[PDB]
Amino acid sequence: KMRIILCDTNEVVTNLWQESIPKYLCIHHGHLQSLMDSMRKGDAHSYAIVSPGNSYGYLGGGFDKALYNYFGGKPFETWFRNQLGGRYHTVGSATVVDLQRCLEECRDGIRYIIHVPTVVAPSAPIFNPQNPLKTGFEPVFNAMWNALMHSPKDIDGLIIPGLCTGYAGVPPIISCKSMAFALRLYMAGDHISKELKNVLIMYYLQYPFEPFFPESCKIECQKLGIDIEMLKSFNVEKDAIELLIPRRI
Amino acid sequence: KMRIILCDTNEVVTNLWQESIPKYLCIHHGHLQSLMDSMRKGDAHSYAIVSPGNSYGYLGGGFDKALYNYFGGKPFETWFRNQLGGRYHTVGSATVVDLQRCLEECRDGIRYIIHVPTVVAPSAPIFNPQNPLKTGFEPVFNAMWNALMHSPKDIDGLIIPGLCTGYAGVPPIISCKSMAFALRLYMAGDHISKELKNVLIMYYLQYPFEPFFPESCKIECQKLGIDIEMLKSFNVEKDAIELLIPRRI
Numbered sequence: 256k257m258r259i260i261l262c263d264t265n266e267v268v269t270n271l272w273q274e275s276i277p278k279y280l281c282i283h284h285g286h287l288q289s290l291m292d293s294m295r296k297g298d299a300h301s302y303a304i305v306s307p308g309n310s311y312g313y314l315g316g317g318f319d320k321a322l323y324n325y326f327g328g329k330p331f332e333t334w335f336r337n338q339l340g341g342r343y344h345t346v347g348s349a350t351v352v353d354l355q356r357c358l359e360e361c362r363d364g365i366r367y368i369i370h371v372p373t374v375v376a377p378s379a380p381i382f383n384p385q386n387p388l389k390t391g392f393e394p395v396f397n398a399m400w401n402a403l404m405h406s407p408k409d410i411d412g413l414i415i416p417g418l419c420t421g422y423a424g425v426p427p428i429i430s431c432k433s434m435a436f437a438l439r440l441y442m443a444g445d446h447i448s449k450e451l452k453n454v455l456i457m458y459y460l461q462y463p464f465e466p467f468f469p470e471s472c473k474i475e476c477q478k479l480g481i482d483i484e485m486l487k488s489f490n491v492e493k494d495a496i497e498l499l500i501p502r503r504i
Numbered sequence: 505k506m507r508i509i510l511c512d513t514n515e516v517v518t519n520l521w522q523e524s525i526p527k528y529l530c531i532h533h534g535h536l537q538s539l540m541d542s543m544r545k546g547d548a549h550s551y552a553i554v555s556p557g558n559s560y561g562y563l564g565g566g567f568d569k570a571l572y573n574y575f576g577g578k579p580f581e582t583w584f585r586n587q588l589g590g591r592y593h594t595v596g597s598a599t600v601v602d603l604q605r606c607l608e609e610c611r612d613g614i615r616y617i618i619h620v621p622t623v624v625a626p627s628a629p630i631f632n633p634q635n636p637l638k639t640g641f642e643p644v645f646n647a648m649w650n651a652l653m654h655s656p657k658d659i660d661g662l663i664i665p666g667l668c669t670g671y672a673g674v675p676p677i678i679s680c681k682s683m684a685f686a687l688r689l690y691m692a693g694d695h696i697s698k699e700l701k702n703v704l705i706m707y708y709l710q711y712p713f714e715p716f717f718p719e720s721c722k723i724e725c726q727k728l729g730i731d732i733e734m735l736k737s738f739n740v741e742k743d744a745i746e747l748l749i750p751r752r753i
């Protein structure tokens with residue numbers, strides 16, 4: 256029902272998205288502005304856009320800079336930061352800013368900005384090749400999951416750029432995989448129980464804790480064609496997400 | 505106005521708390537149950553208790569086990585997890601569960617449980633001595649900050665145990681320092697602007713990004729007696745938090 260639009264200027268990110276994502280989803284290789292421009296030929300809708308930002312709400316670089324220029328510049332940023340409460344927001348959290356209040360600076364059909372802090376500050380990248388899981392796969396999954404979970408149920412579409420693939424420094428090959436997995440779970444809709452999706456996330460992130468894998472979910476894996484053994488040994492570095500969520504689902 | 509009660513069975517944690525925290529704050533060395541017992545001699549109040557849990561809401565170990573036994577066991581946990589929405593909650597987020605709904609399992613004077621995921625699952629510790637900042641100081645600060653920020657404004661007191669100092673594996677010496685810093689900011693009340701507190705957090709976490717340090721905050725540092733140079737080189741491993749928030753404030 257909700258159209259997901261992945262947008263990025265980096266070809267590496269868009270190509271990987273195409274290669275890993277099975278209408279309800281669109282991929283735009285280019286600037287946010289070019290997407291918004293062509294977004295006026297089909298309408299003659301309400302959207303939310305994901306902001307991979309910092310813990311303080313400043314919109315001075317990367318994707319956020321696009322938003323900065325598009326919505327009003329400095330005065331907008333000042334307004335934006337105050338909507339966020341003006342204080343430190345932790346990475347792993349998400350806050351929705353409703354632009355509807357633009358009626359005392361409105362723009363296009365975007366009513367919401369889903370602010371997801373991906374870095375405390377852009378003083379350095381978050382990624383460390385020594386642990387691509389803790390500084391790559393996990394943080395990216397968390398940002399995508401939070402973006403999807405916080406998306407207002409009333410919007411027509413959701414605009415999302417590569418997460419942590421810019422100033423955060425996470426390789427596209429890692430980020431795109433976590434983004435794809437989060438999307439695949441979302442796309443599965445109610446075809447997979449909330450609890451089983453929990454388990455898939457737990458093993459995808461490599462936290463094999465049996466106590467959190469109920470028998471009912473094992474029964475569900477059997478019914479859905481999800482190999483429990485491959486699940487229990489899932490290696491995000493080498494295994495295809497198709498093993499956790501078979502395309503048939 | 506709000507009484508903060510730090511509670512833990514580990515003497516190392518309580519001693520460090522005493523040594524690092526300047527009535528409005530109480531420290532209980534012992535089990536949560538012993539605290540709740542003695543919490544009946546002064547009343548003849550509404551509280552919130554912080555749960556350093558997992559991303560799935562299970563209450564099977566550590567402090568959470570105390571809550572599990574105290575509030576009703578398995579049936580309570582089942583109810584609790586559903587109040588949390590029944591799905592994966594990211595580390596770096598916090599969700600408040602209102603026990604008031606216990607009137608169709610109520611207990612003492614605790615009305616809220618502030619659930620703060622400190623681990624995805626207790627399959628292993630989050631701490632890594634190779635980077636005590638990314639896996640220790642930062643996650644602990646984030647949990648304390650989220651606990652304080654999400655504490656309902658209507659409660660009389662807030663019960664908080666050591667964060668990430670159990671199954672998470674963070675050394676008490678690291679966790680207690682981040683807990684103390686978060687408390688010191690909270691205790692400073694309006695004596696320090698929201699923006700300056702942001703900057704102190706930014707440097708405490710070691711993200712020296714000048715663009716996020718406004719001139720107005722520098723002026724404030726000067727007025728408050730906060731050495732801007734020591735601030736800009738703050739080393740959470742060696743520097744005292746008293747340098748960021750002078751006790752005079």
Ligand SMILES: Nc1ncnc2c1ncn2[C@@H]1O[C@H](COP(=O)(O)OP(=O)(O)O)[C@@H](O)[C@H]1O
Pocket residue numbers: 262263264265268285286287288307308316317318319321373374416417418419420421422423424
């Ligand atoms: N104007 C833009 N339009 C579309 N995509 C952009 C634009 N600017 C940056 N991006 C892309 O957005 C992604 C994330 O960027 P960034 O803002 O730096 O966030 P993060 O700090 O999480 O990495 C990158 O893949 C980058 O190529």
Ligand SMILES: Nc1ncnc2c1ncn2[C@@H]1O[C@H](COP(=O)(O)OP(=O)(O)O)[C@@H](O)[C@H]1O
Pocket residue numbers: 511512513514517534535536537556557565566567568570622623665666667668669670671672673
């Ligand atoms: N019953 C209890 N009463 C008071 N403190 C407790 C109790 N059980 C555990 N703790 C303390 O709570 C802290 C955090 O415990 P834990 O639940 O394992 O969370 P985390 O996974 O974040 O480390 C530890 O310092 C531990 O000693």
Ligand SMILES: [Cl-]
Pocket residue numbers: 286287288289321
């Ligand atoms: Cl743009």
Ligand SMILES: [Cl-]
Pocket residue numbers: 535536537538570
């Ligand atoms: Cl106890």
Ligand code: NA
Pocket residue numbers: 307308309372373374422423
């Ligand atoms: Na960012």
Ligand code: NA
Pocket residue numbers: 306307308316317318319320
């Ligand atoms: Na950005």
Ligand code: NA
Pocket residue numbers: 556557558621622623671672
């Ligand atoms: Na925990």
Ligand code: NA
Pocket residue numbers: 555556557565566567568569
């Ligand atoms: Na616990």
